[PDB]
Design a protein around this nucleic acid. Structure first.
Lengths: 361, 95, 79, 92, 102, 102, 93, 98, 79
DNA sequence: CTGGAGAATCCCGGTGCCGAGGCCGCTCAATTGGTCGTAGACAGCTCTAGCACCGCTTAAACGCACGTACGCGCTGTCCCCCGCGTTTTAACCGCCAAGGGGATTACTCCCTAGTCTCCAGGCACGTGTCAGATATATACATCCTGT
DNA sequence: ACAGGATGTATATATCTGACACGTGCCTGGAGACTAGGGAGTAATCCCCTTGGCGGTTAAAACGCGGGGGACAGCGCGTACGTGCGTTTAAGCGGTGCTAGAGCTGTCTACGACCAATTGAGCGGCCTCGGCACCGGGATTCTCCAG
């Protein structure tokens, strides 16, 4: 056997730069909308602590016309109630607060109502994006049950807003054995990433007969950006020109190839169910599998891309993609994501692997 | 017609000599029943308890007005102001 | 309401006992607020003692013990 | 001889709350003196309270009312709830 | 143990020994040290929680008495509890009056 | 033959011993302690009633009223520092007018 | 059913110091609360003195130290003098 | 000569010493002071060094609380500079002289 | 003698800077020096009284903690 | 800027009423007297450890010039609060019920005290190495004075 | 107003290093039963005393108006204090030494608990008389416009 050509993969990287050449106008449109919306959320007394977390997070790099903009919110200390031993769905209870911050004034009972938060958040967005002059931002709609809130900025700039709570507390107990960068980077980098705050985004437990629960699953985007900017065992990896690796290269290759397959086979009703956060977590486990910068060299670009393909097919066959932070949470369960979709994606990736990848042109 | 301040000092010499309760009894008793009605409903008071709490409340406000007079003289005034009362309670540590 | 039942010249009499020569017009509402805070504290502790004694009649000695634990000790009602 | 401090109990509660956080020896001195102080205040006001009603038995009700007298409002409510939960778990 | 049976971390037996030894009353009821050790556990839990949050705010993983000072003095209700208290090695809050600033 | 007469006191040494026993102050009450404490209470009561008697003589009354106790305690500085926390019912305050107001 | 105050004792002390001077009922109640307050202060201070030095016995030395703590200067000197005088009388008889 | 305005160095010292926690009074002269006053009380008392530290903690926290309340008095009198009449006022209100 | 002068001018100035005090008049220093002398006389009188009750010759940290305990100025960190 | 006018206040002196002074009788609590255990007094000896002391060191107190900025003093300005009247409101005092609840006794039986006995958690003593404080270079933040 | 040359504070980087965190062994304090009594709960009951209502009587709150004295703003200016530089001080620190006294251990003994009998001082009820409360007329104390 032989890996696909690294020169061809660098041509794919040139095509990826050509894909992200169109930042400068969409970034200006979303910066104007972010400025106006963040300076009008602050007019509301029930959201006087909101903010934009600084991570512009292209989860969908193959089509930059859809945005997923995350907002942070500095909350008080929170007692967490785990839902149904699912190990990732928690209930938010503001543990004790004498200052009486307005989220607690908004809350229902003791569990923070996620549906009420997203309802009044969509109402404030509805009230304020029509106030934007010479930038037509209108309220679109999505269904299924995901908390994305679609806003279309005047020419194909579809922004799906997801507000995230930011607790500066300690990490929950199910996040203990995760973050396994101890023998890979250091225990010190692990512990300093432990000192950073964690995040909370909603999804009701979609397991068959769980419906509209006020559960909260953990987000990890900022730690993932920080480990993508510091990813080598040698700390100047992809910083000086002797330690150029292919981790960022193979990661963009896997995410671009998967999302172009999901773009191509969208006429079948099976490849909308996945995302590249799953591929990113599996890639971090490949980084655990391939620790050395000598085992991420430019001559190992096709080899590490092959190792990422084989581990993603391992996650498809063995049905186990643990979160890198929660070892007790498989993201590839058979009820959140249908199994025939997994077989279909497995069939397409096995088809593309063994025929020298005719998608690369 | 007296000078504006002569009968005020005469009031000071009057009420410092006198000992009796300066708040009218029954409005204060109604106030105490209202504030207790906030905590536990349907409470009954011994009249000695309302007299005792009135003695203590008057002594507390006379102490507060003495220290308020100290604050207002300290700002080279003779008029006491809510700035003076907030200062006195912030110095004593009661808030 | 009844906090206005703490009358304006009663607050003026309290200040004249305290030694105040001249009173601003905003002293009165603030003094009502301070008196309400003080009675909230004393009656909170007194009602707590009375709820503890399984009684619905706040004695004089309960108010004396509330004032004792706040630090404003009152003599002449029991002890 | 030996001294009787709450040092290991503070440390157990710390690993229960902040699982990978350290605490200095001086902060352990703070918390030993703090728990002795709060125990002293609550036990003292429970003693005064039981003596005022001529009861010779400090009960959990005495301690609850001592907390309600001593600790300020919402923290007192949460602490009374914590003690009540622990006593009800003790009874079963 | 009585601590394990009540689900607590503070020693219920030691609190019962201290209630009997200190001459607070003659008889000490059985639920009394359970309740009292629970209240001590809750207060220590809340202060160590706030202190650990303050320790994360300065990214220190070892709590020094400055963090306890910040924790007690930034919660106004704990400050109301510990108004008499001096924490040693504590300093004060960073608290400048707004008339002083330019 | 009472112990108050044996010590040459006025306050009840037996009652002070009973109150030191049942008040849960210590496990044992030494026998010299109620004598010493009854002496201290007799001296403090004697000092306050002495100054209150002088206060009654100065206002030409032959009966001490609570105003006389207020004047007696608040004029003597040592008894004032003893009872700086204590408000006396029916006491009033001292005549204390500020000279800058006059 | 027996309110045991210090009423007749305060009356004996007053007729010792001013044999032609009376006392009102509220002033007797105030002196009852005063004697009970000073008793609770000195007894509680001796309680904590016994538990600090791990004595289980309040003696006259603990009351002497509690008096020297609670009272101001010349009150402490005269009160320690009166206590030592009365304990010496009680020992000699 | 880069001389600051007369308020700038005061504000950076306020931020610096409110950020710090160490003892501000020098340990040995304060220890001499404590030994002087105890020599007035009871002659030849040895001191536990931790007791001298405890006295210094109480004195520094008492004077810092006193200067907070004194600053409240000085800001109250339309001033910015504390004066001994502010301290006499603050102690008379707290009840140490009255 | 003169050890009360050992509390230096910049020591009181540092205490004022921790206290949030911007400017300091020239007479603050002797007044603060006297106030500290008064506070130490009270605390050490109580602490020496605790020590003399213990029949000892060494003032210890727990004695100063109990002196400040009965003052109300309660200290942690030395028990 | 000194005298008269009057409003207010302190004694004069008679009346009178009701709470302190004062006996009288009952009875729980104090006093007296044995016995007992045991906490505390006393002694002695370990052994930390606080006190004295040197001596080098280096930040820090101390002194001194100095410009500026805040304190205080003064001046008008103007309204806000005192004061006297005239109205209205209701507190207050006395009467007069109706029952809730305090207080007390009366039986009782669970609950804690106390003693025993076995264990296992908690503390003293090791020890490995990790957070932190060190320096040290570098960059981001804040003034202060010239264009 | 904004840029510019400091000036300081914060962030990242090796290097220590003494202190947290954790194992290992003990040993006494908690726990598990077992009993005895005694407090506390509960029932049930006398009667105090709170609640409420009402009538009458008036002292007091309330509102209004005239004005005046103080709060407040502003100008000024004189000095007092901050900032900074240079100059002595002595705090600090390590370091060794001396013995004073905390602390502990055993060894007795006077002292309080405890019980038990024995009786008065203390309290509850009970009249009863001087001191305090009035209530009007003398006498003073004291503020306030003018020839």
């Amino acid at each position: 056997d032989a890996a696909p050509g690294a020169s061809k993969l660098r041509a794919v990287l040139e095509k990826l730069k050509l894909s992200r050449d169109d930042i400068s106008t969409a970034a200006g449109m979303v910066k104007g909308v972010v400025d106006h919306l963040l300076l009008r959320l602050k007019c509301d007394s029930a959201f006087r602590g909101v903010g934009l977390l600084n991570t512009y997070e292209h989860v969908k790099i193959s089509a930059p016309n859809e945005f997923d903009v995350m907002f942070k919110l500095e909350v008080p200390r929170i007692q967490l109630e785990e839902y149904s031993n699912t190990r990732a769905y928690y209930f938010v209870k503001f543990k004790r607060n004498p200052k009486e911050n307005p989220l607690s004034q908004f809350l229902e009972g003791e569990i923070l109502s996620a549906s009420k938060m997203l309802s009044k958040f969509r109402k404030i967005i509805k009230e304020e994006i029509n106030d934007i002059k010479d930038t037509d931002v209108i309220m679109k709609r999505k269904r299924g049950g995901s908390p994305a809130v679609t806003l279309l900025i005047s020419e194909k700039i579809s922004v799906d807003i997801t507000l995230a709570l930011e607790s500066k507390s300690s990490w929950p107990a199910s996040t203990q054995e995760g973050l396994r960068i101890q023998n890979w980077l250091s225990a010190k980098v692990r512990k300093q990433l432990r000192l950073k705050p964690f995040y909370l985004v909603p999804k009701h437990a979609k397991e068959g007969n769980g419906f509209q629960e006020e559960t909260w699953r953990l987000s990890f985007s900022h730690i993932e950006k920080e480990i993508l900017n510091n990813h080598g065992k040698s700390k100047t990896c992809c910083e000086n020109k002797e330690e150029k690796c292919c981790r960022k290269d193979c990661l963009k290759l896997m995410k671009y190839l998967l999302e172009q397959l999901k773009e191509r086979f969208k006429d079948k009703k099976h490849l909308d169910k996945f995302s590249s956060y799953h591929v990113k977590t599996a890639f971090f486990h490949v980084c655990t599998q391939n620790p050395q910068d000598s085992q991420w060299d430019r001559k190992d670009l096709g080899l590490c891309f092959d190792n990422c393909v084989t581990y993603f097919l391992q996650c498809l066959r063995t049905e186990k993609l643990e979160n890198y932070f929660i070892p007790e949470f498989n993201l590839f369960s058979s009820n959140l994501i249908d199994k025939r979709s997994k077989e279909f994606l497995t069939k397409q990736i096995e088809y593309e692997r063994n025929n020298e990848f005719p998608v690369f042109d | 017609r007296y000078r504006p301040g002569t009968v005020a000092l005469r009031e000071i010499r009057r009420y410092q000599k006198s000992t009796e309760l300066l708040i009218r009894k029954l409005p204060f008793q109604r106030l105490v029943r209202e504030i207790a009605q906030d905590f536990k409903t349907d409470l009954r008071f011994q009249s000695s308890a309302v007299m005792a709490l009135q003695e203590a409340c008057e002594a507390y406000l006379v102490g507060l007005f003495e220290d308020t007079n100290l604050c207002a003289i300290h700002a080279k005034r003779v008029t006491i102001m809510p700035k003076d009362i907030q200062l006195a309670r912030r110095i004593r540590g009661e808030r | 309401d009844n906090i206005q039942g703490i009358t304006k010249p009663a607050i003026r009499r309290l200040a004249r006992r305290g030694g105040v020569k001249r009173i601003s017009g905003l002293i009165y509402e603030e003094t009502r607020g301070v008196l309400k805070v003080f009675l909230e504290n004393v009656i909170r502790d007194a009602v707590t003692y009375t709820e503890h004694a399984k009684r619905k009649t706040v004695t004089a000695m309960d108010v004396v013990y509330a004032l004792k634990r706040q630090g404003r000790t009152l003599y002449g009602f029991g002890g | 001889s030996r001294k009787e401090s709450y040092s290991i109990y503070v440390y157990k509660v710390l690993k229960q709350v902040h699982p990978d956080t350290g605490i200095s020896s001086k902060a352990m001195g703070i918390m030993n003196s703090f728990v002795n102080d709060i125990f002293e205040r609550i036990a003292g006001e429970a003693s005064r309270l039981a003596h005022y009603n001529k009861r010779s038995t400090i009960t959990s009700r005495e301690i609850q009312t001592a907390v309600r007298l001593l600790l300020p409002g919402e923290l007192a409510k949460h602490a009374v709830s914590e003690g009540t939960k622990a006593v009800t778990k003790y009874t079963s | 143990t009585r601590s394990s049976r009540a689900g607590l971390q503070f020693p219920v037996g030691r609190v019962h020994r201290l209630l009997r030894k200190g001459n607070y009353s003659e008889r000490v009821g059985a639920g009394a040290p359970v309740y009292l050790a629970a209240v001590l556990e809750y207060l220590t839990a809340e202060i160590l929680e706030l202190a650990g949050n303050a320790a994360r705010d300065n990214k220190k993983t070892r709590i020094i008495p400055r963090h306890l000072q910040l924790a007690i003095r930034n919660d106004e209700e704990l400050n109301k509890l510990l108004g008499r208290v001096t924490i040693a090695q504590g300093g004060v809050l960073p608290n400048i009056q707004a008339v002083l600033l330019p």
